[PDB]
Amino acid sequence: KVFGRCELAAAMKRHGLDNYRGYSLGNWVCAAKFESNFNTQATNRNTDGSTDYGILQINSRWWCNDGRTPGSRNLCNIPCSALLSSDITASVNCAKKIVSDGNGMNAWVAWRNRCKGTDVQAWIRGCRL
Ligand SMILES: [Cl-]
Ligand SMILES: [Cl-]
Ligand SMILES: [Cl-]
Ligand SMILES: [Cl-]
Ligand SMILES: [Cl-]
Ligand SMILES: [Cl-]
Ligand SMILES: [Cl-]
Ligand SMILES: [Cl-]
Ligand SMILES: [Cl-]
Ligand SMILES: [Cl-]
Ligand SMILES: [Cl-]
């Protein structure tokens, strides 16, 4: 499923991402935008045998189990396939665990490089949730 910007903003706000660990809603929309382009089926295999899954490109080395990553931890305690759902709950809950870890959203490189320090409120602008 390819969420629209505003449709995705409302789901993330509805899932309590707004100002979660101090990160306003635009940050999460922006991170989704440059991680996956709002696509819940987005995948990205790395050469180390890890793969990035779903709308926030969560990596199977640390966070989820795909059972084919020699890493590997499952710190969000979920299957990586749950992160490819058109329901964003599993991605959002795993994101909350990651962002709580003191790296914060710097965990997401696309957010560091594309979103961080920018006017992220732009992303929720023209939605009105
Ligand atoms: Cl919080
Ligand atoms: Cl914002
Ligand atoms: Cl865009
Ligand atoms: Cl894979
Ligand atoms: Cl994800
Ligand atoms: Cl192993
Ligand atoms: Cl590991
Ligand atoms: Cl699991
Ligand atoms: Cl969950
Ligand atoms: Cl930060
Ligand atoms: Cl605008």
Author numbering: 1 to 129
Any passages from the paper?
The crystal structure was additionally validated using X-ray synchrotron-radiation sources by both powder diffraction and single-crystal micro-diffraction. The determined unit cell does not correspond to any HEWL structure reported to date in the PDB. Subunits A and B in the novel HEWL polymorph were substantially analogous (r.m.s.d. of 0.60 Å for Cα atomic coordinates). Considering a narrower subset of intermolecular interactions, namely the potential hydrogen bonds among residues of neighboring chains, it appears that the new structure can form about half of the hydrogen bonds that are found in most known HEWL polymorphs. Finally, it appears that the residues that can form interchain hydrogen bonds are not the same in the four examined models; therefore, the packing of the novel monoclinic HEWL is indeed unique within the HEWL polymorphic system and cannot be traced back to a distortion of any known structure.
